[PDB]
A = this chain, B = another copy of it.
Amino acid sequence: MLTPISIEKEHIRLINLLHFINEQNRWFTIKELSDYLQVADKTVRKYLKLLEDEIPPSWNLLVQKGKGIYLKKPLNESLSFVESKILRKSLNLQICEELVFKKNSMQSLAQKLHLQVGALYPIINQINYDIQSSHLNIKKKPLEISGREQDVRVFMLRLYCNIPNDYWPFPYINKQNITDLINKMEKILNVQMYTYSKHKLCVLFAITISRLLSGNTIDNVSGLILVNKNDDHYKTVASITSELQNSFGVTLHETEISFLALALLLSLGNSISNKTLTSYKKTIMPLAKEITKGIEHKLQLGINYDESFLTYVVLIIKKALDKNFIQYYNYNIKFIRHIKQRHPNTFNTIQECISNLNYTVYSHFDCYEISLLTMHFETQRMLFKNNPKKIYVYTSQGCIHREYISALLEKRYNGLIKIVRNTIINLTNESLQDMEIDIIISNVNLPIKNIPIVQISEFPTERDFHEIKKII
């Protein structure tokens, strides 16, 4: 199965591969590289050609033409130097930036790129085709990408998923003026941000500023994810909004503050931790709820999903969104396929339900996150089908006698039952349901309705064990 790959993400694939080659202290055969990238051996060689020629003299790459290639750079340098070159060269990257940030006609854009219109227009058509799954379009006059504003911005941000930490794609926006504002938010929130995370929050601030400069602003938020206007994160952005409006001559209405605030909050997914997690959970919980409802509707498990099941769903969503604030993606490919072979129908179903969200959300869900959800839900199916019946032991004779009965029930039934040793505060249907009790075994009559009770003697008789057996 060839991996489905697109011309928009070529630069992403090259960067990840280059990183892979370096981390591994081993030889890479041309056959093996051809297969990672999915290209002709001759194309693997054109790339090695650029690589060898663009390495700084500091690094060394070996090629004995029988065992393949080997790359080692010093531990103190980063891959930034070559990574940036890959980006500055990527033609399709430049076109996507043009189409999102700049004024052009077909002919004007063809000019900047030193291309014949008959060379550009097939590429544009392909790009228009590829982005349909993202709910975007390319309109013809002026020549630009269009769609829901937040979808357009995340698209750009996702194409920058693995940019180096010192790579700034906006020459017409001075970085420090964004950095000053972030330093200030970091201070107000009394948190410390990882370098990469921060850089990427700067990049998202600049994507947003550039759009506002071009006339483009958010005029519709779906409700599924809003930063509450009383949250520390909305308010911390609101604090810097005036300095930002004055540095760059833009206007941030409420819904832009909320968006940047969401960005802020997400970039703190990891920081070098309490009130953060809480805003995180309140903000994402409604999405976790819609996802769960979506999937349940197709899987028909019949379960009620409790709050800690939904908290894991927030966790997985968080892993998804954090990809913007961590440079390099870890692979897991074997792990993923094992999950996919074990639960193929469930895997596809969840893929479908995630793909019916907004692009803002499903842009971040790959096979791995889907495999995460797949395990999450299949775990419930096993627990609901295999968990033993929970039993509450009620006795007029006090707690020593309660325990003694409890051990007798266990001696007899082992794993067909689970004794609930906590003392129930009262006998209302709510107190029983919040201990998830299925069966009460009592030596006393009780005013209780909708839940099997087996009245037994103060020491169970064989008749008692027989009644209990039936309803277990």
Which residues from B are CB-within-8-Å of A118? 39-40, 42-43
B42 touches A139 (CB 8 A): no
Bound Cα distance from A246 to B352, whole angstroms? 43
- From A38, A41, A297, residue with most partner B Cβ within 10 Å: A38
A1-B356 contact, Cβ under 8 Å, with A39-B118, A118-B42, A126-B126:
no
Q: Which of B4, B39, B116, B139 contacts A40 (CB 8 A)?
A: B116
Bound Cα distance from A138 to B41, whole angstroms? 19
Residues of chain A at interface, number, CB under 8 A: 34
Tell whether A411 is near chain B: CB-to-CB under 8 Å: no
Tell whether A7 is near chain B: CB-to-CB under 8 Å: yes
B121 touches A40 (CB 8 A): yes
Tell whether A125 is near chain B: CB-to-CB under 8 Å: yes
B130 touches A129 (CB 8 A): yes
Contact with B along A134-153 (1 / 0, CB 8 A): 00011110000010000000
Which residues from B are CB-within-8-Å of A39? 118, 121-122
Q: Write the chain B residue with the least CB distance to A7.
A: B126
Tell whether A382 is near chain B: CB-to-CB under 8 Å: no
Bound Cα distance from A137 to B340, whole angstroms? 15
Pairs across A and B, CB under 8 Å, 23 listed? A1-B137, A1-B138, A1-B139, A1-B140, A2-B124, A2-B128, A2-B140, A3-B128, A4-B125, A5-B128, A5-B129, A6-B129, A7-B126, A38-B121, A39-B118, A39-B121, A40-B117, A40-B121, A42-B116, A42-B118, A43-B118, A126-B126, A297-B297
Tell whether A132 is near chain B: CB-to-CB under 8 Å: yes
Which residues from B are CB-within-8-Å of A38? 121, 125
B42 touches A117 (CB 8 A): yes
Q: Write the chain B residue with the least CB distance to A121.
A: B40
Tell whether A80 is near chain B: CB-to-CB under 8 Å: no
